[PDB]
Amino acid sequence: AVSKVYARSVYDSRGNPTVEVELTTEKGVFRSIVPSGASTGVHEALEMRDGDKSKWMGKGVLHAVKNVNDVIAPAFVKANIDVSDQKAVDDFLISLDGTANKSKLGANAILGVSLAASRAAAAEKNVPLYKHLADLSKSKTSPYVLPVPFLNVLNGGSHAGGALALQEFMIAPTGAKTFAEALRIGSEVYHNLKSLTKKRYGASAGNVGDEGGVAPNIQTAEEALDLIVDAIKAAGHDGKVKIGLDCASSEFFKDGKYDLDFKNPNSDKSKWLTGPQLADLYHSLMKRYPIVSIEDPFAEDDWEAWSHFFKTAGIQIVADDLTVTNPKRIATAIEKKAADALLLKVNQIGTLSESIKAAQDSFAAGWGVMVSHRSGETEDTFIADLVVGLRTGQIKTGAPARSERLAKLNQLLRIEEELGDNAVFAGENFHHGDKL
Amino acid sequence: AVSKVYARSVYDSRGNPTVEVELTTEKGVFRSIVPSGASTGVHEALEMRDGDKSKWMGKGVLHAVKNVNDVIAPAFVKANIDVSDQKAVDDFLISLDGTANKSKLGANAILGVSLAASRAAAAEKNVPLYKHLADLSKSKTSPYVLPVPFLNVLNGGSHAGGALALQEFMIAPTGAKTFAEALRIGSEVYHNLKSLTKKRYGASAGNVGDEGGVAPNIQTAEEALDLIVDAIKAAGHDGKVKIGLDCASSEFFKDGKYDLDFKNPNSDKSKWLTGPQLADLYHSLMKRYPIVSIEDPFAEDDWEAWSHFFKTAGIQIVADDLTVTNPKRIATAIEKKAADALLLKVNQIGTLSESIKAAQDSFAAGWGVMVSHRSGETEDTFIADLVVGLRTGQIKTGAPARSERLAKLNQLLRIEEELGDNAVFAGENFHHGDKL
Numbered sequence: 084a085v086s087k088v089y090a091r092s093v094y095d096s097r098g099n100p101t102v103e104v105e106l107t108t109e110k111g112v113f114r115s116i117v118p119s120g121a122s123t124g125v126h127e128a129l130e131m132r133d134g135d136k137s138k139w140m141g142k143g144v145l146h147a148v149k150n151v152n153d154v155i156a157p158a159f160v161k162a163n164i165d166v167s168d169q170k171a172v173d174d175f176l177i178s179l180d181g182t183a184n185k186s187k188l189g190a191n192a193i194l195g196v197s198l199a200a201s202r203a204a205a206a207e208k209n210v211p212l213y214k215h216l217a218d219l220s221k222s223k224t225s226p227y228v229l230p231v232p233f234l235n236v237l238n239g240g241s242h243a244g245g246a247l248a249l250q251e252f253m254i255a256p257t258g259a260k261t262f263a264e265a266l267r268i269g270s271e272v273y274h275n276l277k278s279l280t281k282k283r284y285g286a287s288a289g290n291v292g293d294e295g296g297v298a299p300n301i302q303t304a305e306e307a308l309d310l311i312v313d314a315i316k317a318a319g320h321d322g323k324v325k326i327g328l329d330c331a332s333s334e335f336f337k338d339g340k341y342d343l344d345f346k347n348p349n350s351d352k353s354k355w356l357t358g359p360q361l362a363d364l365y366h367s368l369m370k371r372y373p374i375v376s377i378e379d380p381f382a383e384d385d386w387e388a389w390s391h392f393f394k395t396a397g398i399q400i401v402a403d404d405l406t407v408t409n410p411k412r413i414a415t416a417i418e419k420k421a422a423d424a425l426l427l428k429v430n431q432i433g434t435l436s437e438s439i440k441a442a443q444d445s446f447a448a449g450w451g452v453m454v455s456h457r458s459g460e461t462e463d464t465f466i467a468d469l470v471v472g473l474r475t476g477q478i479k480t481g482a483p484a485r486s487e488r489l490a491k492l493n494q495l496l497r498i499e500e501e502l503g504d505n506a507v508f509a510g511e512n513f514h515h516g517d518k519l
Numbered sequence: 520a521v522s523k524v525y526a527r528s529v530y531d532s533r534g535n536p537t538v539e540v541e542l543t544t545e546k547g548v549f550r551s552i553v554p555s556g557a558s559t560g561v562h563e564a565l566e567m568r569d570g571d572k573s574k575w576m577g578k579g580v581l582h583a584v585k586n587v588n589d590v591i592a593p594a595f596v597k598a599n600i601d602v603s604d605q606k607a608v609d610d611f612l613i614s615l616d617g618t619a620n621k622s623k624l625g626a627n628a629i630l631g632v633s634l635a636a637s638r639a640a641a642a643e644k645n646v647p648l649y650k651h652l653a654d655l656s657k658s659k660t661s662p663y664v665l666p667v668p669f670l671n672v673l674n675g676g677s678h679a680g681g682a683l684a685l686q687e688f689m690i691a692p693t694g695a696k697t698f699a700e701a702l703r704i705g706s707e708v709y710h711n712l713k714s715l716t717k718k719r720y721g722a723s724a725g726n727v728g729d730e731g732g733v734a735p736n737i738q739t740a741e742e743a744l745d746l747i748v749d750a751i752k753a754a755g756h757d758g759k760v761k762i763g764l765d766c767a768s769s770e771f772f773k774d775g776k777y778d779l780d781f782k783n784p785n786s787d788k789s790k791w792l793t794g795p796q797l798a799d800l801y802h803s804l805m806k807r808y809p810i811v812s813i814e815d816p817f818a819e820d821d822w823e824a825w826s827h828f829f830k831t832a833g834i835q836i837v838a839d840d841l842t843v844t845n846p847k848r849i850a851t852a853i854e855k856k857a858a859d860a861l862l863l864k865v866n867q868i869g870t871l872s873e874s875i876k877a878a879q880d881s882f883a884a885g886w887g888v889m890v891s892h893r894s895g896e897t898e899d900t901f902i903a904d905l906v907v908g909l910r911t912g913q914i915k916t917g918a919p920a921r922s923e924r925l926a927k928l929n930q931l932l933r934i935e936e937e938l939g940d941n942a943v944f945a946g947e948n949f950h951h952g953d954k955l
């Protein structure tokens with residue numbers, strides 16, 4: 084039974100405060116650390132920020148922490164909830180908040196308790212977290228599916244100087260036979276890429292962005308793509324490694340058009356593209372490079388551009404800012420046949436129950452699910468057991484650099500080793516890992 | 520009693536393989552993750568690298584892992600050693616290796632077992648790791664000393680483009696009243712610094728180096744120092760924050776002289792400095808900026824330059840490459856009155872026993888001890904409990920960015936909270952935290 088609920092302020096990988104929750108039961112203390120989210124959000128669960136400019140640049144979570152300690156904890160202990168019943172935990176939490184976006188107690192306050200309980204439930208059950216997550220989500224267990232990690236290697240857009248408007252370039256080692264192998268290959272690709280970068284762009288070009296990829300001053304998409312292909316080649320892994328893109332196109336959508344030189348800042352408006360011209364540019368890149376996945380190709384409300392594109396895309400199309408892990412948005416996306424994969428962010432919705440349901444509805448529509456990290460990550464490895472539990476076959480948790488990233492990948496290495504013959508690597512089948 | 524000893528290959532924060540050890544006793548499984556070291560080392564414990572260019576760029580640890588699994592594990596289990604007796608554990612390990620630099624089994628193979636055992640011992644004892652570390656090192660426990668964190672904020676030298684020859688600029692929040700406060704202040708300084716950098720040097724300048732600091736193209740020491748002072752000022756923390764430098768001067772020592780423009784590469788040799796001219800430059804910086812600590816001011820064998828300088832320095836002088844956590848080197852350093860603080864790196868010596876002894880001998884000579892991280896860190900938080908256990912009052916574990924860094928700082932936040940009135944923040948007294 085849960086005897087105590089406590090929260091403290093700890094630090095995320097960007098040096099900003101975040102909430103850490105500790106839950107006590109007769110089996111010990113279970114902890115969870117929440118990734119940074121949005122404190123301002125239409126369609127997404129709102130995390131609570133103190134707003135006191137005199138402390139942590141206005142990013143404290145002291146209120147959030149108080150909410151846990153002073154509001155939830157006592158109500159929670161007295162409720163006598165069975166942690167094995169995740170939905171009862173989550174329904175309790177939600178009912179306490181009373182708002183649609185968790186803006187009363189905060190999504191950061193609520194998620195921390197929701198995930199800790201799942202750790203307490205597995206412990207109680209005497210099973211590894213991923214098996215308990217598999218039970219909650221009613222996923223197939225024979226075998227378990229290890230995911231293809233979509234490793235960030237290079238950043239553009241708002242995350243770099245240079246003219247490149249596309250935000251993230253990932254490598255996906257789909258041709259490996261095991262998680263361990265996929266990870267070794269991805270790291271060698273990454274190290275070759277860091278060598279090439281430093282050689283071509285300067286010592287400076289080798290420093291990393293928030294998720295661990297390089298961010299050199301690049302002008303075009305072809306420039307970024309050719310660099311990556313060179314790296315794969317230099318590593319000796321031609322054909323075993325594919326590319327994934329995160330266009331984050333909401334960032335350069337202006338006036339019904341897309342500005343590919345949005346950093347300009349004398350951008351020639353005669354050069355802005357309509358959804359359809361943009362789709363032609365993507366098709367061109369897709370014919371010349373081994374791209375297998377494109378995230379947010381079009382803006383967050385540009386429904387017609389997604390649909391159109393979806394009709395001839397032929398590769399996995401990931402909804403991130405279009406859906407913000409929001410069920411009403413997902414249902415819309417499904418209905419309009421806008422894409423076929425959801426970027427799942429547990430803190431964008433606020434509870435484990437609602438995260439698992441969002442994935443199930445995706446799976447039910449034949450969509451794939453990519454479990455994702457956040458910009459501001461922690462040493463918490465929760466999403467590693469969750470990706471295995473959900474059997475999605477694909478995770479986006481950063482480059483093979485910075486331990487808030489490696490903590491997850493390291494955890495997948497342990498899970499694989501632990502499963503023995505009961506695990507399969509999604510490989511080329513990452514899109515439908517759930518159905519393998 | 521220890522029933523099993525197992526090792527696996529996991530990844531460090533730079534994407535290179537490292538060894539992870541798991542030790543089983545009747546109290547559970549205790550794990551340790553070793554930081555990356557040197558595979559080539561005069562005066563230091565050698566870590567074992569596979570050298571197979573076809574796997575991980577020749578950085579695998581498969582041999583190291585085999586050494587643990589096939590050599591140590593069986594010998595170790597059969598020996599029936601009491602984990603509470605750290606020295607018996609370490610003596611056993613050393614005797615198995617049989618070399619002065621652990622080059623038979625590897626320092627990476629040996630350290631992993633040596634630290635896991637200490638976790639197993641604390642568990643057995645029913646105490647937090649830091650209390651067990653305090654017991655082993657015979658440190659004062661009333662109160663416990665929380666350290667001033669020496670946060671990396673900006674890198675130069677071999678770690679950046681630009682002409683700046685000094686390798687690391689740290690900030691030490693000595694004027695805070697608690698660990699929690701010191702950390703909040705350091706983070707605000709750091710965030711202001713990242714703002715200023717991006718504003719003055721470009722979007723690119725904001726990417727981070729291996730330890731989390733920025734590495735913009737800077738020309739001079741004064742340029743770096745003025746930036747940092749601006750950041751402290753902008754954060755509103757003037758007077759509560761000091762500066763620490765890591766000169767890594769072995770890197771620009773050539774021909775009995777020091778090249779401050781070693782990246783040149785048409786360096787005017789008439790401009791190289793002798794130990795004494797170099798000391799005059801340091802004195803100049805020390806008069807204009809709040810520098811409280813200088814690491815490796817002079818080259819690793821330039822005994823006379825250290826001594827000379829030590830006579831009028833007046834601030835803490837840290838031995839890193841001069842001593843490489845090597846007892847014979849430490850004794851020499853003490854004897855020649857070359858400095859008064861040791862940078863302690865547990866993996867440079869290979870066992871917990873020898874690390875604790877190196878610190879004790881330092882303390883006995885009136886030296887301070889700065890526990891240090893490594894370039895390639897992990898999610899393991901061992902050095903956080905060790906710094907508290909040793910009561911050193913000072914830790915160098917990176918900038919407030921990248922979780923292989925924050926994992927340690929987050930852990931110090933928990934320890935502080937746990938100690939209540941039994942903890943003091945070293946503050947201005949960091950140099951002699953042991954004597955507080």
Ligand SMILES: O=C(O)[C@@H](CO)OP(=O)(O)O
Pocket residue numbers: 329455456457458459479
């Ligand atoms: O997936 C992520 O980590 C990023 C962008 O893809 O999202 P956010 O920055 O909002 O966390």
Ligand SMILES: O=C(O)[C@@H](CO)OP(=O)(O)O
Pocket residue numbers: 765891892893894895915
């Ligand atoms: O202290 C550290 O982290 C660095 C430099 O100060 O040492 P190394 O790169 O050898 O780990």
Ligand SMILES: [Ca+2]
Pocket residue numbers: 329331378379403404
């Ligand atoms: Ca995205």
Ligand SMILES: [Ca+2]
Pocket residue numbers: 765767814815839840
């Ligand atoms: Ca150093």
